[PDB]
Amino acid sequence: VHLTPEEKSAVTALWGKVNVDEVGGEALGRLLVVYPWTQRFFESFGDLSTPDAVMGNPKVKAHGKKVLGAFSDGLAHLDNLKGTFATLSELHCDKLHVDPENFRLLGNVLVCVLAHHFGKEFTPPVQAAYQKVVAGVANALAHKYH
Amino acid sequence: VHLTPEEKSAVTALWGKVNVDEVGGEALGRLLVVYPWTQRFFESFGDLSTPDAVMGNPKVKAHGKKVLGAFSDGLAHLDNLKGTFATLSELHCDKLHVDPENFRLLGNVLVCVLAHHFGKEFTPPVQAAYQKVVAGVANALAHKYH
Amino acid sequence: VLSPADKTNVKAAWGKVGAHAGEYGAEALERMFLSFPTTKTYFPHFDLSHGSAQVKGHGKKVADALTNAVAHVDDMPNALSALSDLHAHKLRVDPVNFKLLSHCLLVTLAAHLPAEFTPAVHASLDKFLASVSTVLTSKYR
Amino acid sequence: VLSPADKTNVKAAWGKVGAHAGEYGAEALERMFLSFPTTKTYFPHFDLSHGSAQVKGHGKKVADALTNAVAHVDDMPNALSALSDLHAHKLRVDPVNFKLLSHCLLVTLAAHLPAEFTPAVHASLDKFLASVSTVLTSKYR
Ligand code: HNI
Ligand code: HNI
Ligand code: HNI
Ligand code: HNI
């Protein structure tokens, strides 16, 4: 599951260039557009009827900031992702009732968003490192389900 | 996976009643019948033309026995499955080139075979314990892939 | 694609199940909740206590849908049309969970059909449940 | 099922790929081998490292198959009939890997098509690659 020192440096280097608020809104929005059954958790967010209605939805954007904010904080703890995300794992299970498969879907969408943003800079080895990261985060968020 | 003391007890108790030879032959056989693309690894086993030919194939039966035998040995290391299957993990990756998804397919076939044999005795809690085991073994066998 | 041989195997096996179908549906749900606890995230509004009448009632609904699918195995997309609508637009269960329930249905059948659960019938039942799952997720996006 | 808009989106995006189809196929394969090492189990006879002649050659084949699928988007089961035969009876790649390659194709397209890879087009391409994958595994059993 773990990254080489070169991969950790690659992850940190790229993330320094990431506008977390913006990428968060983009990633959550694309999740709800590409996999629209994931809208089941966001009835209170209002209009989700078109791609533009989703991507520009202020509540989607706001929640995307929150989600990727927590993701970003976790990048400082790649050696202990399960510990880092334990309380959020418990919350998503016990209070929010979110199938952890959703974390895997979000991870893949985030990778696509990073590719879209960075272009050729998102090289195959950099992707590989980020695939390790999103798998690790999704597994950590799933770990305390019961 | 982390098994509870109660589940560790249930696993060991049921397995003490298992004919590993028969169950092994049945498990590998049904893998090849139910998911016939898995036959791709066993061209040298000879006749796999029909279900009866698969189930009654001596090399299929023999290999199933060997595989479940290693599985059986792994049950003595439930708190360190990755450690004990590390050698076989590298072997299946580098020498045999076996997609670890096959380990998961075999695990589920094994659970079906156990249910078919034990009937009502294969209770939902006993199944849940064995699902942890087969997932743990599949994950352990996949862990050293590169 | 369900072969003519698959359809005969399924009809015979479910025929043997008979009026036990609702019971086996409930058992499959219980096995699923225990073996794959993430599936419980779809039932936070349920009473999930041991022997839950609400789970048993849901088991009957799932079983009745499967019984109807078997009876219309030549035309399952049409027979399951209303149910597929509900899954796509309301329930919105992630597709990965259909494989978990299918597996637990297979385990349930295996535990109750010592004679009928042959390797061939096992294969046919797995294809059938996968086919039902495909129909139920066919309108998701 | 692919909607009218999906088919418009897929044709436009793949058209923009144009002469780069082979290049992008090979890149997607490389991304897959690096991100998902288990997929390398299907190519023990290949050089899989960057600049591989074998990966470049296979990338061209994959891309050309996709181009054909786009050209016959309303009849993919028949247009890809020989290829689905080969996958079912010879290659026998486990179905899980098709999602991995599909993902890496999306990443490749996103990295090369800044203007074209909108959320709607992203959605359509994902559906398209899932549909192709379904066809290629449709004869497995
Ligand atoms: C598709 C559903 C979904 C996904 C993929 C997802 C993925 C993630 C990931 C993955 C990297 C992270 C780090 C994360 C973090 C958070 N989520 Ni998630 N969440 C999801 C559904 C929710 C919902 C629903 C809430 C509550 C929203 C609300 O209405 O307040 C939530 C709330 C949160 C909160 C706020 C906690 C609180 O209210 O106390 C954080 C932080 N999350 N979410
Ligand atoms: C679908 C394919 C497949 C699966 C699911 C699988 C699952 C498993 C599992 C799962 C719990 C275990 C414990 C296991 C253990 C073993 N395998 Ni598997 N193996 C598989 C494909 C093979 C093949 C192929 C060989 C070599 C065959 C031979 O004997 O030449 C093999 C050889 C072995 C050997 C012999 C090692 C040696 O000769 O030094 C052991 C032990 N294994 N295999
Ligand atoms: C793990 C989640 C899950 C899976 C895999 C699943 C898979 C299936 C399958 C697969 C073979 C079948 C035949 C089936 C049948 C049904 N489901 Ni499922 N359902 C699931 C979670 C639900 C939930 C949740 C409901 C709503 C129940 C309620 O009472 O609120 C539901 C409702 C139903 C209903 C009730 C429809 C109605 O009231 O009009 C039927 C019938 N189903 N479900
Ligand atoms: C991870 C494994 C894997 C995946 C996901 C996959 C998915 C796909 C997809 C999905 C969209 C497409 C369109 C596709 C197309 C093709 N593949 Ni794939 N193939 C895969 C592993 C192979 C292998 C292995 C070969 C044999 C290549 C060789 O040279 O031996 C192959 C060969 C081919 C060929 C060459 C056929 C011929 O020689 O007549 C085509 C075309 N393919 N493959």
Side-chain angles (χ1 to χ4, degrees):
Chain A
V1 69
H2 215 13
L3 297 82
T4 66
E6 307 86 304
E7 284 178 322
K8 291 184 179 181
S9 298
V11 171
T12 302
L14 192 78
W15 200 256
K17 304 177 177 181
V18 166
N19 186 315
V20 177
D21 290 343
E22 190 73 18
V23 173
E26 181 76 9
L28 185 61
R30 281 186 185 245
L31 177 71
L32 271 55
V33 170
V34 176
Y35 310 104
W37 53 96
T38 64
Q39 296 172 21
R40 72 192 307 279
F41 303 104
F42 305 107
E43 38 273 305
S44 67
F45 281 19
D47 187 11
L48 303 171
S49 59
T50 70
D52 287 345
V54 175
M55 300 305 296
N57 185 296
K59 291 183 177 178
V60 169
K61 280 172 160 289
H63 195 62
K65 299 179 184 174
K66 184 185 299 201
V67 165
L68 207 62
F71 179 91
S72 182
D73 297 340
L75 298 185
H77 308 278
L78 292 174
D79 299 328
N80 186 23
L81 289 177
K82 287 173 181 166
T84 304
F85 288 100
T87 47
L88 279 173
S89 182
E90 298 190 22
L91 184 83
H92 281 77
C93 179
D94 295 345
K95 298 291 184 298
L96 306 179
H97 312 293
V98 175
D99 183 352
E101 175 63 21
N102 290 289
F103 307 135
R104 301 182 188 95
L105 293 175
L106 182 60
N108 288 329
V109 172
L110 174 60
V111 170
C112 289
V113 169
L114 293 172
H116 193 213
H117 181 75
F118 286 109
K120 56 185 177 181
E121 187 171 356
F122 200 67
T123 65
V126 170
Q127 175 186 352
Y130 268 89
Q131 297 287 174
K132 287 186 177 180
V133 170
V134 299
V137 170
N139 289 334
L141 281 166
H143 192 250
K144 304 301 183 296
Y145 278 64
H146 61 100
Chain B
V1 201
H2 286 91
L3 277 65
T4 67
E6 293 74 12
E7 288 178 316
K8 289 179 177 177
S9 172
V11 166
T12 56
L14 188 77
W15 197 257
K17 301 179 180 180
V18 167
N19 185 316
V20 181
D21 299 7
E22 286 182 330
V23 174
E26 273 288 309
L28 187 60
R30 283 181 184 252
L31 178 73
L32 300 177
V33 172
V34 178
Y35 312 105
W37 54 93
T38 60
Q39 294 177 20
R40 70 191 303 275
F41 302 103
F42 307 106
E43 188 181 44
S44 63
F45 280 17
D47 186 21
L48 301 173
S49 52
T50 214
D52 293 330
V54 173
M55 304 307 297
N57 185 286
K59 290 181 179 178
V60 167
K61 287 186 173 180
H63 189 57
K65 174 179 178 176
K66 178 180 300 181
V67 164
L68 249 216
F71 181 86
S72 303
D73 293 333
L75 301 185
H77 308 83
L78 290 174
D79 286 333
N80 192 20
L81 288 178
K82 286 172 178 167
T84 190
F85 282 107
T87 296
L88 283 173
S89 181
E90 165 69 18
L91 179 77
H92 279 80
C93 171
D94 178 69
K95 299 299 184 179
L96 305 173
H97 302 110
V98 172
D99 187 349
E101 180 60 27
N102 292 292
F103 303 143
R104 303 177 184 94
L105 291 178
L106 181 61
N108 287 331
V109 172
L110 175 59
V111 170
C112 289
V113 170
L114 292 176
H116 188 214
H117 173 72
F118 283 107
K120 200 183 187 305
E121 188 175 358
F122 199 68
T123 63
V126 167
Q127 174 186 355
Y130 269 89
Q131 297 287 171
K132 289 186 179 179
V133 172
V134 297
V137 170
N139 286 336
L141 282 170
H143 190 247
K144 299 304 183 303
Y145 272 63
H146 60 272
Chain C
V1 172
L2 296 184
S3 72
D6 285 326
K7 300 178 179 179
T8 303
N9 284 340
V10 170
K11 285 180 178 302
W14 207 254
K16 173 67 176 186
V17 171
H20 294 299
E23 177 195 334
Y24 292 178
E27 176 176 340
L29 291 172
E30 175 193 357
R31 291 181 178 277
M32 184 187 67
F33 293 147
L34 285 181
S35 286
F36 307 108
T38 58
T39 62
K40 291 187 296 184
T41 63
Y42 294 99
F43 300 86
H45 58 303
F46 268 36
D47 164 32
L48 297 178
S49 64
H50 194 269
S52 163
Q54 192 166 24
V55 170
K56 291 191 183 305
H58 192 58
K60 188 175 185 303
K61 296 180 183 178
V62 174
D64 287 349
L66 289 177
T67 298
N68 185 255
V70 173
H72 299 73
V73 71
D74 289 324
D75 193 22
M76 299 205 317
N78 190 238
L80 288 160
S81 165
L83 186 55
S84 188
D85 286 340
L86 187 65
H87 276 263
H89 298 137
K90 267 71 177 182
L91 307 182
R92 288 168 290 183
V93 174
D94 190 278
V96 298
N97 297 280
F98 290 83
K99 296 180 181 302
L100 304 180
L101 179 57
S102 291
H103 171 69
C104 287
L105 283 161
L106 220 51
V107 169
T108 298
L109 293 174
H112 286 281
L113 305 179
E116 293 78 8
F117 202 72
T118 65
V121 171
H122 179 172
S124 298
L125 287 171
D126 199 42
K127 288 181 62 181
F128 168 71
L129 292 173
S131 185
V132 170
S133 299
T134 295
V135 173
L136 293 186
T137 59
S138 64
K139 303 171 182 178
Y140 266 41
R141 60 175 179 172
Chain D
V1 189
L2 300 176
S3 72
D6 288 327
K7 292 180 283 180
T8 297
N9 291 343
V10 169
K11 288 180 180 295
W14 199 249
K16 227 60 176 178
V17 167
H20 298 278
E23 286 182 349
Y24 293 179
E27 177 178 338
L29 288 166
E30 178 181 8
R31 291 179 176 280
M32 185 188 64
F33 296 136
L34 292 180
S35 287
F36 309 108
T38 59
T39 62
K40 297 193 298 183
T41 61
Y42 293 99
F43 303 84
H45 56 297
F46 270 41
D47 168 26
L48 295 176
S49 298
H50 189 76
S52 171
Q54 281 166 300
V55 175
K56 285 177 180 177
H58 179 52
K60 179 61 161 50
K61 298 182 184 178
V62 174
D64 288 347
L66 290 176
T67 297
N68 187 45
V70 173
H72 295 279
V73 69
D74 299 298
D75 192 41
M76 292 193 286
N78 287 307
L80 304 179
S81 191
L83 187 55
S84 59
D85 284 343
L86 185 70
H87 278 263
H89 300 142
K90 183 181 172 190
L91 304 180
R92 289 170 287 188
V93 176
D94 190 279
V96 171
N97 298 282
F98 289 84
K99 296 179 181 299
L100 303 178
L101 180 57
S102 292
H103 172 68
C104 289
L105 283 161
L106 290 184
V107 170
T108 301
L109 296 180
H112 285 283
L113 306 175
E116 289 71 18
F117 201 75
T118 65
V121 168
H122 179 172
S124 298
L125 285 168
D126 195 46
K127 290 181 64 184
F128 168 74
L129 293 173
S131 188
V132 170
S133 296
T134 291
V135 171
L136 293 185
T137 60
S138 64
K139 298 170 180 175
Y140 269 36
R141 64 175 175 175

